[model samples]
Target: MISLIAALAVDRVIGMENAMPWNLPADLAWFKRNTLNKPVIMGRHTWESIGRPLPGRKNIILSSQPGTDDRVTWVKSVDEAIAACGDVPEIMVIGGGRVYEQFLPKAQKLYLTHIDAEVEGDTHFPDYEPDDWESVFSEFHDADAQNSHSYCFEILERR
Candidate 1:
């Protein structure tokens, strides 16, 4: 199974750090809880944006830069990344922008954290036609002491 896990704001802004414009703890934990121990494939910038190998998961990087980590597998493309998963059964794509854009149509599932606030950012989530998918799960949360913004954890699958 291939899935995408991303946090986006009201304007569909995604990243910068550039910085994620909003802070939400529960959403972060939700991301870690579901993606941990799975094969996590990412683009070059996403891998660098994260800055290190994510512990407890297979780190697969699709990069033009030439290098390898004992803890990371550098793949040339997303297709290669999925192939690298082999018998792993499930793989997760954690994105910056382009990776999500390239994989969104083919992705089996999407775990999205939709934030209420809109701020500045360079990357936006890929635009999708709602008619092609269905939201199988959704839970909304208001801004609380720990979570800075009101958000929803939504899981969508292609219809």
Candidate 2:
């Protein structure tokens, strides 16, 4: 199965200048809690943003140019990334922008954190009809010492 995990602002903004626009530790933790040991896929820019592979997970990155990184597997296309996952039951698409758009149609599950505030951003999550997804789980959290925004964790499965 292919799933996507992302934290987006109310206006569906996910990034600004190749970096996330907000600081939400709780959402970050939620991301790790769910995808900790899974095979995660990302685009080159997203990989560049992190600067290194995430610990405790297989980091598969898609790039237009060939590269060498013993810490991660570099693939040229989405199909290659899917092949790299092999027989894994599920794969997580962790994105910057275009990567998410490419996988959104084929993704069966979505782990989304909807931040209450809206901010300017250069990249946005792909649009999808709410009627096409069935909510499987949801939880709301308030802003606290570590997190600067109120948000809700929502898991939606394709209906």
Candidate 3:
């Protein structure tokens, strides 16, 4: 099954100029722990933003172009990426706007870090209806202790 892990603001903004606007150590730690051994799927732009593959995980970059690299398994479509994941226990759909739009419907779970503030950005997550998902778990973290920016970590399963 496909899963998504991301952070967003109230306006659904994700990134401003190809990078996240705030740093959240707890959220980063959570992400690393969960996706360490899984296959991660992302768009070419998102991969480029990272500059290199994240270690300890299989990286699959989706692109319409043809190319090959030691760290990346390049595929042309979301379905192709899903097929490539095979029987891996978990597959993560990491993002950029276009990629999220393409895979959101197929995702079975969502891991979100909901920021309490709004940010100005060109990229945004797809608009999702509340009825489409059920909140399975949630934990709020304050700015004083963990993340400099206040946020809530939430996990939702598709209904």
Candidate 4:
């Protein structure tokens, strides 16, 4: 199975100036907990934004750049990224707008954190049809000392 994971603002903004527009430690922890030990596929820009391989997970990066390491497998295309994952039960697609768009059609599940506030950003999540997926899980989280915005964790499976 292929899944996409993201945290986006009410406006669907995901990034600004190469960084996340808001700070939410609670969401960050959620991200790490869910993605850890999974094979994660990401675009070159997303890899650059992260700057290094994420520990405890196999980082399969789709990049035109040529390189490799113990922690990262740099690939040239979406197909190559999936191929790199081999026989994994599931692979998670992390993002940048372009990458998310490329993988959205093939994604079977979505793990999304929705921030309540609108924000401006250079990159936004791709538009998708709501009818194509069904919400299987959801939880609301109010803003607290560590997190600046109210957020909802919603998991959707392709319908």
Q: What is the TM-score of each candidate against the true structure?
A: 0.94, 0.97, 0.94, 0.95
Q: Give the poorly placed runs of model 4, Cα more than 4 Å off.
A: 68-70
Ranking by TM-score: 2, 4, 1, 3
Worst 10 residues of 1 by lDDT: 16-25
Clash pairs, candidate 4, are none
Q: Sort every candidate by lDDT, greatest first.
A: 2, 4, 3, 1
TM-score pick, better of 2 and 3: 2
Writing each residue's lDDT as its tens digit, candidate 2 over 1-159 gives 999999989779998898886888888899999898899999999999999889999999999898778779999999999999889888999997999999999999999999998888889999989999999999999989988889999999999
Could you tell me which 10 consecutive residues in candidate 3 have the lowest summed lDDT? 65-74
lDDT agreement with native, every candidate: 0.85, 0.92, 0.87, 0.89
Clash pairs of candidate 3?
A: none
lDDT of 3 by residue, 76-118 (tens): 9878899988898779988988999988988899999898877
Error of 2 at 90 (Å): 1.0
**Global lDDT of model 3:** 0.87
Error of 4 at 94 (Å): 0.6
Backbone clash pairs for candidate 1 read 16-19
Q: Model 4: per-residue lDDT, tens digit, 10-103?
A: 7799998888767898898999988998999888778878888898999888878787555688889888889989998889999988989999
Total backbone collisions, model 1: 1
Q: Mark the 10 consecutive residues where model 4 has the least summed lDDT.
A: 63-72
Better model by TM-score: candidate 1 vs candidate 4:
4
The segments of candidate 1 whose C-alpha lies over 4 angstroms from its true place after superposition are: none
